[PDB]
Write a protein that binds this ligand. Structure first.
Ligand code: COA
Ligand code: COA
Lengths: 427, 427
C-alpha cells in the first residue's frame, strides 16, 4: 500500500528544493502534476545537459514519478485552468521567488476560496517576517545564512559549503514533513493549511548542535573537544597558537566530531592519487577500552591521563597522527576491517564512483536504475525510508508537456477547446 | 489545532537522530514518553555539560516536549510495563545497536501481536540487507558513508565533514517523514508498519546532486561548473595540475555552486581577522549584464568570452577573484545589500553568534528561548516549518525519571503497585 495513493499534487516547482519534495511524494504514491513554462519548462531541463536537446540529469533525477503540462500562467485562460486544477488538488507546491504566486493572483486567501481542502506548501529562502524575506536564494546562499558554512571547514581556511544539498533538497525534505503534518491536520479539521519552509531554517535545524556549541561557548569561554582547545595544535595564518581566548563564535574545527563523539580523518594507501582513500576514526567515551587493543598499546588502560575525556584532550591529536602511519600500508576497507573486530564506529570515506555502483545500495533500493526508454537509463537515489508493507516503483521523468492533453481531458475539457488553448499559446 | 495531537510516542532513543525526530513530533503536538536507563539515562545528559550536575545543552536542545520515565527493560517486570505501554502507543521509535530491541524480546513480530496499530520506526547506520547492516555509526562515519565527505572540502585537502548534522539530525528528519507516511498508510489499512532510515541513506539523499555529477562525469568526461574545469586553476598539495582529463569520481569543488548556479565564497572587509567575514556570490546565467553593471565592466557584456556560461568556463575563478576585489572595504551585510540592488543571489556567512541573537529568527519562531526554571533558559531551534493555523509551544526537557510515577498512573496502576516497583528497582 502506498502512503500517498490518491493524493493529488499540483506541482508548480522548479530547480531542486520543490521538485525533490514532490518527487519523493510521488515515490510514496502521490499523483504529481508538474506545471511548467511553455518552450523551456523547468530550468533544470536545459541545465548542464550531458546530451544536446535531451533533458538533463538534474531534471530526470528530481522529476521521476511526475507528469508534465505546459502552461502560460501570465494569461487569462491559464489562470482559469489553474483554478480548475486547484479544485481537484490535495496539495499545491511552489518554490518560485517571493511574491511570485501572489502576483499571479494566487494568494493563500484566494486559494482557500477555490478549495477549502487544499494545502499550499512553499519553499522560500527566508521565513515570512524575516528582514530578508524578499530575497532569492540558491543552495549555498542558504548554507551561509543558516550557520553551516561558518562551522564547516578548517580554522585557517574559509567558510565551507557542504557537498550535501543542505539548502535545496534538505528544504524539500522538511517541506515534506510539513505537508504530511498538514494532511494529518486535515483529517481532524477537514481543512487545508498553508505550510512553508525557509531554506535558512532547514539548514539551521541541521546545525542545532552548533547552536548548542554557541551557548556553551558564551557560558564557559571554551569548547573542550574542539581542536582550538588542544595545546599548540591548531595554528592561525601567522605562525601562532590558536585557543579559545578571543573566540566568541563557534569556529571551524576541520574534521573533529561535531554532534558525534571525538574523531579525525585519516589517510590510507594511495591517498596522493586517490582523493577519497581515507577513513574516519571515532574515539568515544563508551568504548575506550576496546580501542586500546588494535594500537597494541595497553599502557593507556591504567593511565588516568589517557582513559578519561578530560584526561585525554590535552593530547587528542597526538593519538590521531599516531595511527595515520599505522594505516599507511592498507586501503580504506582493509583499515576498516583491521579495527572493526572491536565494535568501533570507524568507516571509509565512500567516493561517488563507489556509491553509484555499489551492489548493496542497489539491492536495498537506495540507488535505483531508472528504466528510461526515451533517454536511456540513469541512476537515481530512491526512497531513503524503507517500509515493511510497501516498495516505491520509480518511473521515468516526463518530457515537456508530455501529459498536457491527457491532463486537460481529465479536467473535462473537450477536444476542440484543447486545440484553442494550443493555438492561443496558453498550453 | 496541532498536527500530531493525540499521537502517543514510545521513545526509546538516545543521542541525536532518534531524539531529534521525536522532539520535532513533540513540537507538532505528539505526546512523547522518553524511556531511559535507571541512573544514567540518555548519554547526552552527561556529555559536554556547561555546568556539572546539570543536564547538558546537548540533552535539552534535543529533548524538549518530552516526558521521562526510568525503566530497566532487562528485568521481567520492566517487560510487562513495556507491553502495557506499547498497547497505548501509536508509534515506537528506537535507535540502539542494529538488533538491540530484538534481543530484548520485542521483535517486530511480537509488537504486532500486542498492538496491530503501532508503528515501529528505527534509525540505523546502514539499511537492512546492506553488507554493513550490523555496524554502529556516529555522525561523521555516516557522512563518510553517504558521499558527503568525499565531495565536501577542497581538491587539495582531505574529505571534510560538514558542521551540519547530515548523519544524525538529517536521519531523524527523514524518519519523521517515514513515520508520518506510515500514519497515512494506517488511515487506509487500520494497521501499523515498520519504517526504517539508515544514516547512509539519508546522507545519500542529500547528496543526490553529486550522483547527478558522477553520471555526468562518466558520460562526458567533464563537470564544466567545477573549478577544475578552468585550465591551470586547481592543483593538488604537491602542485600537480588537476583537470577532468584524469578525474573519474566527483571531486571536492571548494565553494562551487552545487545544485545552485555557479558561485563562490568571497572575502569581505576584516576576513584576515573575522573567520566569518564572507558572502556567497552567485553568477547566474540570466544575470551577466547586471553583474557587469555592478563591477563596472560594460566591455564584458557583449563579449562572447564573458557573456555565456560556456565562455566563462575557462576564466570563472578569475572573474570571482576580480569581483571579490570590489568587496575589500565593505562588510558582509553591505555587500549583501549592494548585491540585492541588482537582484543577485548573495548572502552573508552568518556566524553562530549572529544567528543566536538575530531578531528575525526569534520573531519567526526559528530560534526560540525555552523557559527552563531548573537549569536556566536556553535557546533552541524550533519548528522549521511554519503553518497558517498552528504554532508550536516548546517546553523544557525532562529531568531523568521526572515523570515515571505520572506515567505509571496513566497506565492505570494504583498507589501500592507503584510503591512496589520503586522497591524492586524496576523504575
Ligand atoms: C530559485 C530562484 C532563485 C530562481 O529565481 P528566478 O529564475 O529569477 O525565477 P522566479 O522563481 O523568481 O520566477 C520568475 C517569474 O516567472 C514567473 N513564472 C513562473 N512560471 C511561469 C509560467 N509557467 N508562466 C508564466 N510565468 C511564470 C514567476 O511567477 C515569476 O514572476 P514575477 O516576475 O512576478 O516574480 C527562485 O525561484 C527562488 O528564490 N525560489 C525560492 C527558494 C528556492 O527554492 N530556491 C532554491 C531553488 S530550488
Ligand atoms: C549511537 C550508537 C553508536 C551508540 O551505541 P552504544 O554506545 O554502543 O550503545 P548501544 O546502542 O549499542 O546500546 C547498548 C546496550 O544497552 C541496551 N539498553 C539501552 N537502554 C537500556 C535500558 N534503558 N535498560 C537496559 N538496557 C538498555 C541496548 O539494548 C544495548 O543492548 P546490547 O548490548 O544487547 O546491544 C548506536 O546506538 C547506534 O548506531 N544507533 C543506531 C543509529 C543511530 O541513531 N546512530 C547515531 C546516534 S544518534
Amino acid at each position: 500500500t502506498k502512503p500517498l495513493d490518491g493524493i493529488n499534487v499540483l506541482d508548480f516547482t522548479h530547480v531542486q528544493a520543490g521538485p525533490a519534495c514532490t518527487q519523493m511524494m510521488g515515490f510514496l504514491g502521490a499523483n504529481v502534476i508538474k506545471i511548467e513554462r511553455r518552450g523551456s519548462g523547468d530550468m533544470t531541463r536545459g541545465w548542464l545537459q550531458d546530451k544536446p536537446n535531451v533533458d538533463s540529469l538534474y531534471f530526470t533525477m528530481f522529476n521521476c514519478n511526475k507528469r508534465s503540462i505546459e502552461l502560460d500562467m501570465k494569461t487569462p485562460e491559464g489562470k482559469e485552468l489553474l483554478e480548475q486544477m486547484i479544485k481537484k488538488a490535495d496539495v499545491m507546491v511552489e518554490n518560485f521567488g517571493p511574491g511570485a504566486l501572489d502576483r499571479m493572483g494566487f494568494t493563500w486567501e484566494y486559494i482557500q476560496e477555490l478549495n477549502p481542502r487544499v494545502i499550499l506548501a512553499s519553499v522560500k529562502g527566508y521565513a515570512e517576517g524575516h528582514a530578508n524575506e524578499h530575497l532569492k536564494v540558491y543552495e549555498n546562499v542558504a548554507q551561509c545564512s543558516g550557520g553551516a558554512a561558518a562551522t564547516t571547514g578548517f580554522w585557517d581556511g574559509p567558510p565551507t559549503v557542504s557537498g550535501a544539498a543542505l539548502g535545496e533538497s534538505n528544504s524539500g525534505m522538511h517541506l515534506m514533513i510539513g505537508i504530511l503534518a498538514a494532511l494529518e491536520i486535515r483529517h481532524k479539521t477537514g481543512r487545508g493549511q498553508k505550510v512553508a519552509v525557509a531554506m535558512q531554517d532547514a539548514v539551521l535545524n541541521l546545525v542545532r548542535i552548533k547552536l548548542r556549541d554557541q551557548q556553551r561557548l558564551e557560558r564557559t569561554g571554551i569548547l573542550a573537544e574542539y581542536p582550538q582547545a588542544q595545546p599548540n595544535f591548531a595554528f592561525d595564518r601567522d605562525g601562532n597558537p590558536l585557543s579559545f581566548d578571543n573566540i566568541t563564535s563557534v569556529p571551524r574545527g576541520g574534521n573533529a566530531g561535531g554532534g558525534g563523539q571525538p574523531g579525525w580523518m585519516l589517510k590510507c594507501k594511495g591517498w596522493e592519487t586517490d582523493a577519497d582513500s581515507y577513513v574516519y576514526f571515532t574515539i568515544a567515551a563508551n568504548m575506550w577500552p576496546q580501542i586500546c587493543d588494535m594500537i597494541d598499546k595497553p599502557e593507556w588502560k591504567d593511565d588516568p591521563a589517557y582513559n578519561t575525556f578530560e584526561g585525554r584532550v590535552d593530547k587528542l591529536m597526538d593519538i590521531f597522527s599516531f595511527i595515520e602511519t599505522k594505516f599507511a600500508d592498507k586501503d580504506k576497507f582493509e583499515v576498516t576491517e583491521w579495527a572493526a573486530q572491536y565494535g568501533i564506529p570507524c568507516g571509509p570515506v565512500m567516493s561517488m564512483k563507489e556509491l553509484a555502483h555499489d551492489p548493496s545500495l542497489q539491492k536495498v533500493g537506495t540507488v535505483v536504475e531508472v528504466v528510461d526508454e526515451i533517454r536511456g537509463n540513469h541512476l537515481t537515489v530512491g526512497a531513503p525510508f524503507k517500509f515493511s508493507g510497501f516498495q516505491p516503483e520509480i518511473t521515468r521523468a516526463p518530457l515537456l508537456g508530455e501529459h498536457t492533453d491527457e491532463v486537460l481531458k481529465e479536467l473535462g475539457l473537450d477536444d476542440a477547446k484543447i486545440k484553442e488553448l494550443h493555438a492561443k499559446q496558453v498550453v
